[PDB]
C-alpha cells in the first residue's frame, strides 16, 4: 500500500541521519560496536556503513552504491548516501497529494541528463599550465591539512607527502601501498618517510644490546618453518629403553635443528624472516655469525617484502634457489619513537612503502592517519583523470542553479520536480556548514547572491567562515566523483521508491 | 580379469565378451531380411527390457 | 465464502497490478536463507512464497502452466483471472447463481478465441533475419528492464539468429533447445562493450601453461571423461604400499607411463584436451611442453552441448585418441572479461553451432542479475513462433483489449437469454489492462479512458473499420499532448501468448467460483 512506501522512506532517513554529521573532514564520527567487540573510529563512510548490517531491505541499497563508490572512485562515500536519500525525503509530501511516484522517479533522470552535460562544461583540463610537478603536489597538500592540529607542523609533512607518491608509478597508484604504523610517544614533527617496511620490536629475549646498526648489502631470506630446540612454553618427552640413549636423542634433536641452521650459513643470508617464533638456539648461534633473524613476522608485512626485493619465501632451507634472496641499499635501526626499530631503505624494486608517524597518543595519530588518506586520494585521481572540477560545494551549488532556470522552460509536472531536485541539492553545502559550526541561514543566503552574477567558481571557505572561491583555496575534486555520485544516487533513489511491498520470508 | 598390454589390445578383450552378445545380435538383424526383407512396409522394433 | 475468497485474491490481485508494464513496481523478496533478491516477474515470487489458501493455489498452479510452452503472460493470467472474479461480485450480490456465471464465460470464451483469428494483422515469415527478430524481442524486453530495451535488442536478436539454422517449409526436424542459449554476467563495465560471439563461454582460468592456441583453423579437441593418471586394470588393481623399496618404483613408474601415454595422444595431432575430471600434477607438466591447451570442465552439463558444436565425444577411458571422435575449432584463446582472463570458445564462418552464449557486463550486479532473467524470458518468446500458426500476431499495449470489447458487446445483443448479463460483464473486465498502464505511468486515469474509446469508435461508410486499427494505450511521459501508433515502435504481443493466457485465465477464474466450501481433515 501507499503506507509501505512512506514507511520505507522514513527507514532510510534514520540511516541517512547518522551519516549526515560524517560529511566533511571536520564532521562528527560514528561510534560502532562490532559483534567481535573491537571498537573502530573513522570518518570514512565506506567502512562505517559496512558495519551496520541493517536488516531493512532498502538500507542494503545504500550499501551497494557505497561499495561502487569506494571501488571505482574511493572518495565521497558519505555524500553519495546522503544525496540518494535526500530525494526521497523531499518527495514525501508529493505522494500525499496524489502524485504517482513514477513521474517523480522519471523526473529525476530528466535533470540528470542535463547534469551530465553540465559536468563536461565545468570540467577544466589543466596540467602544466601555471603549475609544475612539485608546486602541484605542495599546494594541494596544505589544503587537506588545514583546520587541523598539524597545520603548524605541516611544513615538514608536505615534503614527505610529495616524495611518497613519487616513489611509486604515476600511471598506477594505490593508497594501500603506503603503510602507516602508529608509534606512541615523541614529537609529531620528527617523523620520517621510509621506502621499505618496519617491524614492531616484539623481542623479549636476552641477547639484545649487541648488534651493528649499519649493513652494506645484506641478503634477505624468508623461511616458512620455525627452527627451535627448547622453547619457553612446550617441552619434549623422550622415553627409550636404554639409559645411554637419553642424551643421544637430546643430541639428535639438536643435530636435526642444526642441519637446517648450517644450510642458511652456507647460503650467507644476513636477514631471516619467519612468521613463527624462533627459539633461543638459533638466536645464539646466529650471533657469532653476524646473522640477523626476526620471528613472528606478520603476514601482511612479509607479503610486502616479496614485492620489495623481488624475492620469495621457501618452505625448507635445502632447496632454496638463488633468486629467492634479496638485497636492499641500506639497513639502519634508529631510536626514532623512543624505541629501536629496524627497517629496510633504498629498495629500487619496492612496489610499496611505509610512512611512520609519531605522537603523544595513538588516537591522535589515527586522526592524522585518516587525514593523510584524503590527500592521497586527491593525487590518486589527479593523475589518471585529467578533468578537475572545483569541489567543496562549488560545483554542487552550480548544478542546482542552472536546473532552476530549466524548469521554467519545461512545461508540465517536470517543472516542480526539477525545482525540487535542485532544492534537494542544497543539503550538501548546508550540512558542511552545520558540521563545522557555521550558520546555515546566513551563509547559504549570502552565497546565492554572487552565485547568480555569472561566476560559476564560487565555493565555500573551510578555514574562516565567509563566501569565497575554492580556486584560491586550492580545494579540488576530480570530475569522476560528480559523475558517479549523480548516477549512483539516482539509481538508488529510483530503486527504493519502486518498492511498494516488503516481503520477508522466515525459516 | 582383462589384462591388456596396449590400448588397442583392450578393445579386443572388450569385444570378446560382447562377441557373445554380438553372436545373438547377428541373428536378430538377419531375421528381418530373411522374411520380407525387400518387401515394402516392413520394420523391426526392439522391445527388450 | 466466494466473496470472502475474492477479498483474499484481491490482495494478491493488487500485487500484480504494479507488476505488468514498464512503469510498474518491483517487489523485494527476502529469502529465509538471508539473501535479498528483487525481480519483476511474479512467477518467481510465487515460488519463494508458500501458497496455502485453496483459491490462491488455483492461480499459482495456473501460473506454472504459463511458464511452460511460453515465457510471457505471467502477469497476464494473474490480472485477467483476478478481474473476472471482481466483476462477478455484482452478479453474486444480485442473486445470480455461480453455475450460470461459469456457463456464461464458456460461451464468451469460444466467441473470443474465434475472433482472435480474424483480428490478426501481420504474420511472421520466419525469415530469421536480424531486423525481423527486433520486432518480436523488443516488446518482450519491455515491462521488465527499463532503458535496456534498445540496447539489448541487438544483443539478443543476434544471438538467437546464430542458433536458428537456414531452412524453409520444413516442420519435421525440431530445433531451438532451451539450454542452447546461455546468459552469463560479469561485474564491471557496461552494456556498450557487450558483443555477440558464436560459442560457449567458460569462466574457469587457463591453468595450463598455454594461454592461447595458434591462428590455424580446425584445431582438434579431445574430451576425456576419465581423469589423467596411469593406466590401471578394470578388475581390482588397487595400489598398495609394502616396503620403502617399492616407493621409489611408484614415482618413477608413473613418471614414464604418464609421459608415454600423453606422447602418443599428442602425436595424433590434437592440440586441445578437455578433462572432465581432476588433472594430475605430473600429467599437466607433460602437455604444457608439447603445446597442448589443458581445459578442465567439471560440469557434465557443459560437455553435452559441446558435442553438437565442436563434434567431440566424451571417452570413458583414457589412452585411446580416436581421430573419428575428435572435433574441430578454428580459434581458442583467452580474453580478459571484467578484469579476469578466461579461456573462451568461438569460431568464424564454419562448423555451424547450435549453442551460443551471451556475454554481459555491468557495474551493479543487482540490476544486472534481472537482465539475465529478462533475456531468458526473451529467449522463450522465440518459442512462440512455430509451424501451427505461430507467426500470427496482434497489436499490444491495450490496442487489442479495448478493440475486443466493442466486438463482444455486439455478440451480446445477438444472443438471447440470460447470457447477456455474462457477456456484458465479460467485456468490462478487460478495462483493467489499460487502467494498469495508465495508473502506473502517473497519467490521469480519467483523461486516458475517454480518449481510448473515442479512437476505437469511429463512423465509417461500412461495417469494417479500415484506416486505423492500430490505436493503443500509450505511455506518454511527454509535455503536452499526443500519442504514438503501435506500428511506429513495433511493440506488440504475439497471438500465441494472448490466446494461451486468456484460455487458462478463463478456466482458472471459473474454477474458483465452483468451490463454495472447503473441508480440511487429517490425512
Residues 259-288 of C with CB under 8 A from A: none
Can you tell me the distance from the alpha carbon of A201 to that of A213, in angstroms, rounded to the nearest whole number?
Answer: 14
Contact C98, C92 (CB under 8 A): yes
Chains that touch C (3 or more CB pairs under 8 A): A, B
Please, what sign has the CA dihedral across residues C298, C303, C309, C312?
positive
Q: Over the Cα atoms of chain A, what is R_g? A: 29
- Angstrom CA distances, C341 to C182, C185, C333, C334, stand at 19, 14, 10, 6
Closest by CA position to A106, among listed A119, A83, A87: A87
Closest by CA position to C396, among listed C220, C138, C172: C138
Residue B40 neighbours by CB under 8 Å, 6+ apart: none
Say yes or no: A224 and A320 in one domain.
yes
Residue C354 neighbours by CB under 8 Å, 6+ apart: C163, C165, C175, C177, C180, C308, C309
Q: C373-387 b/e with 16+ CB inside 10 Å = b?
A: bbbebbbbbbebbee
As beta bridge partners, residue C429 has: none
Can you tell me the distance from the alpha carbon of A89 to that of A424, in angstroms, rounded to the nearest whole number?
Answer: 9
DSSP state of C441: T
Taking the Cβ of residue C30 and every Cβ of chain A, the question of whether any pair is shorter than 8 Å is answered with yes
Total residue length of chain B: 49
Can you tell me the distance from the alpha carbon of C518 to that of A233, in angstroms, rounded to the nearest whole number?
Answer: 74
Q: Closest approach of chain A CAs to the CA of C472, in angstroms?
A: 21
Taking the Cβ of residue C245 and every Cβ of chain B, the question of whether any pair is shorter than 8 Å is answered with no
Closest by CA position to C190, among listed A107, A487, A78: A487
**Would you call C28 and A100 a contact, using CB atoms and an 8 Å cutoff?**
no
The CATH number linked to A170 is 3.30.260.10
Taking the Cβ of residue C444 and every Cβ of chain A, the question of whether any pair is shorter than 8 Å is answered with no
Can you tell me the distance from the alpha carbon of B10 to that of C232, in angstroms, rounded to the nearest whole number?
Answer: 12
As beta bridge partners, residue A388 has: A124, A478
Taking the Cβ of residue C129 and every Cβ of chain A, the question of whether any pair is shorter than 8 Å is answered with no
Can you tell me the distance from the alpha carbon of A501 to that of A461, in angstroms, rounded to the nearest whole number?
Answer: 44
Sort residue C329 into left (φ over 0), alpha (ψ -120 to 50) or beta: beta
Can you tell me the distance from the alpha carbon of C508 to that of C83, in angstroms, rounded to the nearest whole number?
Answer: 12
Contact C26, C37 (CB under 8 A): no
Sort residue A22 into left (φ over 0), alpha (ψ -120 to 50) or beta: alpha
φ/ψ of residue C356, rounded to 5: -130, 165
Can you tell me the distance from the alpha carbon of A368 to that of A150, in angstroms, rounded to the nearest whole number?
Answer: 8
**Would you call A499 and C23 a contact, using CB atoms and an 8 Å cutoff?**
no
CA angle A451, A453, A454 (to 5 degrees): 90
Contact A485, A79 (CB under 8 A): yes
Can you tell me the distance from the alpha carbon of A432 to that of A460, in angstroms, rounded to the nearest whole number?
Answer: 9
- Residues in chain C preceding a C-to-N separation beyond 2.5 angstroms (breaks): none
- Angstrom CA distances, C179 to C165, C250, C310, stand at 16, 44, 16
- Angstrom CA distances, C180 to A490, C156, C358, C512, stand at 37, 13, 11, 39
Minimal Cα distance from C46: which residue of A? A503
Can you tell me the distance from the alpha carbon of C353 to that of C307, in angstroms, rounded to the nearest whole number?
Answer: 10
CATH node for C199-350: 3.50.7.10
Contact C338, C361 (CB under 8 A): yes
Contact A304, A344 (CB under 8 A): no
Can you tell me the distance from the alpha carbon of A302 to that of A274, in angstroms, rounded to the nearest whole number?
Answer: 8
Q: Closest approach of chain C CAs to the CA of B11, in angstroms?
A: 10
Can you tell me the distance from the alpha carbon of C201 to that of C195, in angstroms, rounded to the nearest whole number?
Answer: 13
Total residue length of chain C: 523
CA angle C508, C509, C510 (to 5 degrees): 95
Minimal Cα distance from A502: which residue of C? C28
Angle of helix C399-414 versus helix C432-440 axis, rounded to 10: 150
Locus of grid cell 546566513:
A442
Residue A441 neighbours by CB under 8 Å, 6+ apart: none
The pairing of beta strand C181-187 with beta strand C356-362: parallel
Contact A351, A177 (CB under 8 A): yes
Can you tell me the distance from the alpha carbon of C144 to that of C139, in angstroms, rounded to the nearest whole number?
Answer: 10
As beta bridge partners, residue C182 has: C357
- Residues in chain A preceding a C-to-N separation beyond 2.5 angstroms (breaks): none
Which chain C residues are within 8 Å of A505, Cβ to Cβ?
29-32, 48-49
- Kindly report, as residue ranges, where domains of CATH 3.30.260.10 are found in chain C: 124-198+351-391
Angle of helix A101-122 versus helix A414-424 axis, rounded to 10: 60
Residue C493: CB atoms within 10 Å: 23
C-alpha cell recorded at residue C158: 543476434
Which stretch of DSSP H or E encloses residue C65?
helix C54-67
**Would you call B1 and C233 a contact, using CB atoms and an 8 Å cutoff?**
yes
Q: How many Cα atoms within 13 Å fall on the side-chain side of residue A415?
A: 8
Taking the Cβ of residue B3 and every Cβ of chain C, the question of whether any pair is shorter than 8 Å is answered with yes
Can you tell me the distance from the alpha carbon of C433 to that of A370, in angstroms, rounded to the nearest whole number?
Answer: 57
Considering the segment(s) C1-123+392-523 as one domain, its CATH architecture is Orthogonal Bundle (1.10)
Can you tell me the distance from the alpha carbon of A12 to that of C399, in angstroms, rounded to the nearest whole number?
Answer: 40
Can you tell me the distance from the alpha carbon of C118 to that of C404, in angstroms, rounded to the nearest whole number?
Answer: 11
Chains A and B touch (3+ CB pairs under 8 A): no
Contact C357, C199 (CB under 8 A): yes
Q: Closest approach of chain A CAs to the CA of C338, in angstroms?
A: 13
For residue A355, the SS3 value is strand
Sort residue C177 into left (φ over 0), alpha (ψ -120 to 50) or beta: beta
Start-to-end Cα distance in chain B: 28
Which stretch of DSSP H or E encloses residue A256?
helix A245-267
Q: Over the Cα atoms of chain B, what is R_g? A: 16
φ/ψ of residue A315, rounded to 5: -70, -55
- Kindly report, as residue ranges, where domains of CATH 1.10.560.10 are found in chain C: 1-123+392-523
Closest by CA position to A194, among listed A383, A367, A330, A294: A330
Instruction: Give Cα C55 to chain centroid, integer Å.
Output: 28
Residue A226 neighbours by CB under 8 Å, 6+ apart: A274, A276, A277, A278, A279, A295
Can you tell me the distance from the alpha carbon of A350 to that of A331, in angstroms, rounded to the nearest whole number?
Answer: 14
For residue C484, the SS3 value is coil
Say yes or no: A208 and A351 in one domain.
yes
Locus of grid cell 501451427:
C388
Contact C286, C262 (CB under 8 A): yes
Can you tell me the distance from the alpha carbon of C159 to that of C286, in angstroms, rounded to the nearest whole number?
Answer: 38
Locus of grid cell 490496442:
C399
Residue C144 neighbours by CB under 8 Å, 6+ apart: C40, C41, C370, C373, C374, C377
Taking the Cβ of residue B5 and every Cβ of chain C, the question of whether any pair is shorter than 8 Å is answered with no
Q: Is C360 exposed, middle or buried (0-12, 13-18, 19+ CB in 10 A)?
A: buried
**Would you call A499 and C479 a contact, using CB atoms and an 8 Å cutoff?**
no
- Angstrom CA distances, C168 to A294, C125, C164, C389, stand at 78, 10, 11, 15
C-alpha cell recorded at residue C208: 595450463
**Would you call C235 and B1 a contact, using CB atoms and an 8 Å cutoff?**
yes
A418, A492, A494, A503: best to mutate for the C interface, most C CBs within 10 A: A503
Residue C228 neighbours by CB under 8 Å, 6+ apart: C258, C262, C275, C279, C280, C283, C284, C318
Locus of grid cell 611505509:
A354
**Would you call C48 and A491 a contact, using CB atoms and an 8 Å cutoff?**
no
Which stretch of DSSP H or E encloses residue A220?
strand A219-223
What torsion, rounded to 10 degrees, do the Cα atoms A99, A102, A104, A106 define?
A: -150
Q: What does A446-469 look like in DSSP terms, one character per residue?
A: HHHHHTTTT---EEE-SSSSSEEE
SS3 labels along C151-209 = HHHHHHHHHHHHHCCCCCCCCCCCCCCCCCEEEEEEEECCHHHCCEECCCECCCCCCCC
Q: Closest approach of chain C CAs to the CA of B29, in angstroms?
A: 26
CA angle A218, A220, A221 (to 5 degrees): 140
Say yes or no: A311 and A275 in one domain.
yes
- Angstrom CA distances, A9 to A12, A86, A95, A393, A420, stand at 5, 10, 11, 26, 17
Taking the Cβ of residue C364 and every Cβ of chain A, the question of whether any pair is shorter than 8 Å is answered with yes
Residue C353: CB atoms within 10 Å: 20
C-alpha cell recorded at residue C175: 530445433
B3, B6, B7, B14: best to mutate for the C interface, most C CBs within 10 A: B7
Which stretch of DSSP H or E encloses residue B12?
helix B7-34
**Would you call C234 and B1 a contact, using CB atoms and an 8 Å cutoff?**
yes
DSSP state of C427: H
Contact A500, A5 (CB under 8 A): yes
Say yes or no: A352 and A328 in one domain.
yes
Say yes or no: A176 and A266 in one domain.
no
Say yes or no: A158 and A137 in one domain.
yes
Closest by CA position to A91, among listed A349, A421, A322: A421
Locus of grid cell 638463488:
A322
Can you tell me the distance from the alpha carbon of C230 to that of C222, in angstroms, rounded to the nearest whole number?
Answer: 18
Contact C61, C504 (CB under 8 A): no
Residue A163: CB atoms within 10 Å: 14
Residue A245 neighbours by CB under 8 Å, 6+ apart: none
Say yes or no: A302 and A173 in one domain.
no
Which chain C residues are within 8 Å of A410, Cβ to Cβ?
479
Say yes or no: A271 and A337 in one domain.
yes
C11, C31, C51, C364: best to mutate for the A interface, most A CBs within 10 A: C364
Q: How many Cα atoms within 13 Å fall on the side-chain side of residue C119?
A: 26
Q: Closest approach of chain C CAs to the CA of A36, in angstroms?
A: 20
As a 3-state breakdown, chain A gives helix, strand, coil percent values, each rounded to 5, of 50, 15, 35
Start-to-end Cα distance in chain A: 25
Instruction: Give Cα C222 to chain centroid, integer Å.
Output: 32
Closest by CA position to A318, among listed A231, A217, A221: A221
- Angstrom CA distances, A370 to A198, A391, A428, C132, stand at 20, 19, 21, 58
Can you tell me the distance from the alpha carbon of C78 to that of C505, in angstroms, rounded to the nearest whole number?
Answer: 7
Can you tell me the distance from the alpha carbon of C368 to that of A440, in angstroms, rounded to the nearest whole number?
Answer: 41
φ/ψ of residue C427, rounded to 5: -80, -30
Can you tell me the distance from the alpha carbon of C299 to that of C320, in angstroms, rounded to the nearest whole number?
Answer: 22
Residue C155 neighbours by CB under 8 Å, 6+ apart: C191, C194, C195, C196, C358, C360
Can you tell me the distance from the alpha carbon of C245 to that of C103, in angstroms, rounded to the nearest whole number?
Answer: 90
CATH H-level superfamily of C124-198+351-391? TCP-1-like chaperonin intermediate domain (3.30.260.10)
Domain that holds residue A275: 198-383
Q: A42-62 b/e with 16+ CB inside 10 Å = b?
A: bbbbbebbeebeeebbbbbbb
φ/ψ of residue B47, rounded to 5: -95, 5
**Would you call C30 and A504 a contact, using CB atoms and an 8 Å cutoff?**
yes
Closest by CA position to C81, among listed C53, C109, C107: C109
Which chain C residues are within 8 Å of B11, Cβ to Cβ?
320
Closest by CA position to A175, among listed A399, A352, A326: A352
Longest dimension (CA), chain C: 106
C-alpha cell recorded at residue A231: 622453547
Locus of grid cell 585529467:
A386
Say yes or no: A171 and A264 in one domain.
no
Closest by CA position to A100, among listed C153, C281, C23, C90: C23
Closest by CA position to A402, among listed A94, A107, A20, A116: A116
- Kindly report, as residue ranges, where domains of CATH 3.50.7.10 are found in chain C: 199-350
The CATH number linked to A343 is 3.50.7.10
For residue A462, the SS3 value is coil
Can you tell me the distance from the alpha carbon of A296 to that of C382, in angstroms, rounded to the nearest whole number?
Answer: 64
CA angle A5, A8, A12 (to 5 degrees): 140
Say yes or no: A232 and A182 in one domain.
no
Contact A148, A29 (CB under 8 A): no
**Would you call C477 and A57 a contact, using CB atoms and an 8 Å cutoff?**
no
- Angstrom CA distances, C452 to B37, C116, C406, C420, C458, stand at 71, 20, 12, 24, 11
Minimal Cα distance from C257: which residue of B? B6
**Would you call C234 and B3 a contact, using CB atoms and an 8 Å cutoff?**
no
Experimental technique, in short, is: cryo-EM
Say yes or no: A224 and A338 in one domain.
yes
Residue C397: CB atoms within 10 Å: 23
What torsion, rounded to 10 degrees, do the Cα atoms C367, C41, A499, C76 define?
A: 140
For residue C502, the SS3 value is helix
As beta bridge partners, residue C521 has: none
Minimal Cα distance from C319: which residue of B? B7
Can you tell me the distance from the alpha carbon of A57 to that of A53, in angstroms, rounded to the nearest whole number?
Answer: 10
Contact A293, A265 (CB under 8 A): no
Contact A140, A424 (CB under 8 A): no
As beta bridge partners, residue C183 has: C358
Residue A52 neighbours by CB under 8 Å, 6+ apart: A15, A32, A59, A63
Say yes or no: A212 and A324 in one domain.
yes
Q: What does A67-127 look like in DSSP terms, one character per residue?
A: HHIIIII-S-HHHHHHHHHHHHHHTHHHHHTT--HHHHHHHHHHHHHHHHHHHHHH-EE-S
Sort residue C50 into left (φ over 0), alpha (ψ -120 to 50) or beta: beta
DSSP state of A71: I
Amino acid at each position: 500500500g501507499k503506507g509501505q512506501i512512506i514507511s520505507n522512506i522514513n527507514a532510510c532517513v534514520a540511516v541517512q541521519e547518522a551519516l549526515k554529521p560524517t560529511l566533511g573532514p571536520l564532521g562528527s564520527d560514528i561510534l560502532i560496536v562490532t559483534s567481535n567487540q573491537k571498537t573502530t573510529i573513522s570518518n570514512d563512510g565506506a567502512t562505517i556503513l559496512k558495519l551496520l548490517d541493517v536488516v531493512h531491505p532498502a538500507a542494503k541499497t545504500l550499501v551497494d552504491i557505497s561499495r561502487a563508490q569506494d571501488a571505482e572512485v574511493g572518495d565521497g562515500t558519505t555524500s553519495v548516501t546522503i544525496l540518494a536519500g535526500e530525494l526521497m525525503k523531499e518527495a514525501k509530501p508529493f505522494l500525499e497529494e496524489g502524485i504517482s511516484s513514477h513521474l517523480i522517479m522519471k523526473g529525476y533522470r530528466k535533470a540528470v541528463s542535463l547534469a551530465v552535460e553540465k559536468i563536461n562544461e565545468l570540467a577544466v583540463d589543466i596540467t602544466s599550465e601555471k603549475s609544475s610537478g612539485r608546486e602541484l603536489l605542495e599546494r594541494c597538500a596544505r589544503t587537506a591539512m588545514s583546520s587541523k592540529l598539524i597545520h603548524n607542523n605541516a611544513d615538514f609533512f608536505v615534503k614527505m607527502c610529495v616524495d611518497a607518491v613519487l616513489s611509486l608509478d604515476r600511471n598506477d597508484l594505490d593508497d594501500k601501498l603506503i603503510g602507516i604504523k602508529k608509534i606512541p610517544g615523541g614529537a609529531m614533527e620528527e617523523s620520517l618517510f621510509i621506502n621499505g617496511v618496519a617491524f614492531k620490536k616484539t623481542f623479549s629475549y636476552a641477547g639484545f644490546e649487541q648488534q651493528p646498526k649499519k649493513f652494506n648489502n645484506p641478503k634477505i631470506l624468508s623461511l616458512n618453518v620455525e627452527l627451535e630446540l627448547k622453547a619457553e612454553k612446550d617441552n619434549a618427552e623422550v622415553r627409550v629403553e636404554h639409559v645411554e640413549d637419553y642424551q643421544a636423542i637430546v643430541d639428535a634433536e639438536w643435530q636435526l635443528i642444526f642441519e637446517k641452521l648450517r644450510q642458511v650459513e652456507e647460503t650467507g643470508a644476513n636477514i631471516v624472516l619467519s612468521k613463527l617464533p624462533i627459539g633461543d638456539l638459533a638466536t645464539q648461534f646466529f650471533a657469532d655469525r653476524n646473522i640477523f633473524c626476526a620471528g613472528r613476522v606478520s603476514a601482511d608485512d612479509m607479503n610486502r617484502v616479496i614485492q620489495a626485493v623481488g624475492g620469495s619465501i621457501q618452505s625448507t632451507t635445502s632447496d632454496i634457489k638463488p633468486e629467492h634472496l634479496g638485497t636492499c641499499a641500506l639497513f639502519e635501526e634508529m631510536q626514532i619513537g623512543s624505541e629501536r626499530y629496524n627497517l629496510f631503505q633504498g629498495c629500487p624494486q619496492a612496489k610499496t612503502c611505509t610512512l611512520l608517524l609519531r605522537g603523544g597518543a595513538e588516537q591522535v595519530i589515527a586522526e592524522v592517519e585518516r587525514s593523510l588518506h584524503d590527500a592521497i586520494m586527491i593525487v590518486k585521481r589527479a593523475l589518471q583523470n585529467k578533468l578537475i572540477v572545483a569541489g567543496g560545494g562549488a560545483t554542487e551549488m552550480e548544478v542546482s542553479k542552472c536546473l532552476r532556470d530549466y524548469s521554467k522552460t519545461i512545461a508540465g509536472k517536470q517543472q516542480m520536480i526539477i525545482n525540487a531536485f535542485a532544492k534537494a541539492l542544497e543539503v550538501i553545502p548546508r550540512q558542511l556548514c552545520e558540521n563545522a559550526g557555521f550558520d546555515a541561514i546566513e551563509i547559504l543566503n549570502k552565497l546565492r547572491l554572487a552565485h547568480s552574477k555569472g561566476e560559476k567558481w564560487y565555493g565555500v571557505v573551510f578555514e574562516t567562515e565567509n563566501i569565497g572561491d575554492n580556486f584560491a583555496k586550492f580545494v579540488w575534486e576530480p570530475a569522476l566523483v560528480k559523475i558517479n555520485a549523480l548516477n549512483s544516487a539516482t539509481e538508488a533513489t529510483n530503486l527504493i521508491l519502486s518498492v511498494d511491498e516488503t516481503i520477508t520470508n522466515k525459516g | 580379469g582383462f589384462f591388456y598390454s596396449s590400448a588397442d589390445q583392450r578393445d579386443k578383450l572388450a569385444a570378446s565378451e560382447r562377441k557373445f552378445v554380438d553372436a545373438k545380435l547377428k541373428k536378430i538383424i538377419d531375421l528381418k531380411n530373411e522374411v520380407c526383407g525387400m518387401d515394402p512396409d516392413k520394420g523391426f522394433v526392439i522391445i527388450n527390457q | 465464502q466466494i466473496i470472502k475468497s475474492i477479498a483474499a485474491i484481491r490482495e494478491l490481485h493488487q500485487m500484480c497490478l504494479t507488476s505488468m508494464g514498464p512503469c510498474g513496481r518491483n517487489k523485494i523478496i527476502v529469502n529465509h536463507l538471508g539473501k535479498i533478491i528483487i525481480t519483476n516477474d511474479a512467477a518467481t515470487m510465487l515460488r519463494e512464497l508458500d501458497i496455502v489458501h485453496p483459491a490462491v493455489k488455483v492461480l499459482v498452479m495456473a501460473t506454472e502452466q504459463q511458464k511452460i510452452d511460453m515465457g510471457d503472460g505471467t502477469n497476464l493470467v494473474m490480472i485477467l483471472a483476478g478481474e473476472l472474479l471482481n466483476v462477478s461480485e455484482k452478479l453474486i450480490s444480485m442473486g445470480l447463481s455461480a453455475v450460470e456465471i461459469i456457463q456464461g464465460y464458456n460461451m464468451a470464451r469460444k466467441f473470443t478465441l474465434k475472433e482472435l483469428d480474424e483480428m490478426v494483422v501481420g504474420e511472421i515469415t520466419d525469415k530469421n533475419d536480424k531486423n525481423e527478430l527486433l520486432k518480436m524481442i523488443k516488446p518482450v524486453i519491455s515491462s521488465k528492464k527499463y532503458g535496456s530495451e534498445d540496447i539489448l535488442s541487438e544483443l539478443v536478436s543476434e544471438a538467437v539468429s546464430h542458433v536458428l539454422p537456414v531452412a524453409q517449409q520444413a516442420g519435421e526436424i525440431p530445433y531451438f533447445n532451451v539450454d542452447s542459449i546461455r546468459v552469463v554476467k560479469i561485474m564491471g563495465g557496461s552494456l556498450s562493450n557487450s558483443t555477440v560471439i558464436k560459442g560457449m563461454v567458460f569462466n574457469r582460468e587457463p591453468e595450463g601453461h598455454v594461454k592461447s592456441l595458434s591462428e590455424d583453423k580446425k584445431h582438434k579437441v579431445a574430451v576425456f571423461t576419465c581423469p589423467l593418471d596411469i593406466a590401471n586394470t578394470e578388475t581390482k588393481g588397487t595400489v598398495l604400499l609394502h616396503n620403502a623399496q617399492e616407493m621409489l618404483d611408484f614415482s618413477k613408474g608413473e613418471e614414464k607411463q604418464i609421459d608415454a601415454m600423453m606422447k602418443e595422444i599428442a602425436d595424433m595431432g590434437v592440440e586441445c584436451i578437455v578433462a572432465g575430471a581432476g588433472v594430475g600434477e605430473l600429467a599437466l607438466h607433460y602437455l604444457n611442453r608439447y603445446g597442448i591447451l589443458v581445459l578442465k570442465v567439471p560440469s557434465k552439463f557443459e560437455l553435452r552441448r559441446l558435442c553438437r558444436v565442436c563434434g567431440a565425444t566424451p571417452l570413458p577411458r583414457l589412452g585411446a585418441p580416436t581421430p573419428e571422435e575428435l572435433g574441430l575449432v578454428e580459434t581458442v584463446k583467452t580474453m580478459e572479461i571484467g578484469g579476469d582472463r578466461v579461456t573462451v570458445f568461438k569460431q568464424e564462418q564454419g562448423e555451424i553451432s547450435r549453442t551460443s552464449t551471451i556475454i554481459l557486463r555491468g557495474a551493479t550486479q543487482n540490476n544486472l542479475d534481472d537482465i539475465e532473467r529478462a533475456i531468458d524470458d526473451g529467449v522463450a518468446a522465440v518459442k512462440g513462433l512455430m509451424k501451427p500458426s505461430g507467426g500470427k500476431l496482434l497489436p499490444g499495449a491495450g490496442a487489442t483489449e479495448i478493440e475486443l470489447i466493442s466486438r463482444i458487446t455486439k455478440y451480446g445483443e445477438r444472443t438471447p437469454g440470460l447470457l447477456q448479463l455474462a457477456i456484458k460483464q465479460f467485456a468490462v473486465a478487460f478495462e483493467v489492462v489499460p487502467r494498469t498502464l495508465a495508473e502506473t505511468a502517473g497519467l490521469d486515469v480519467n483523461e486516458v479512458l475517454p480518449n481510448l474509446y473515442a479512437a476505437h469508435n469511429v463512423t465509417e461508410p461500412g461495417a469494417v473499420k479500415t484506416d486505423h486499427l492500430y490505436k493503443g494505450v500509450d505511455i506518454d511521459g511527454e509535455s503536452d499532448e499526443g500519442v504514438k501508433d503501435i506500428r511506429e515502435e513495433n511493440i506488440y504481443d504475439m497471438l500465441a501468448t494472448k490466446k494461451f493466457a486468456i484460455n487458462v485465465a478463463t478456466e482458472a477464474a471459473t474454477t474458483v467460483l465452483s468451490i463454495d466450501q472447503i473441508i480440511m481433515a487429517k490425512k
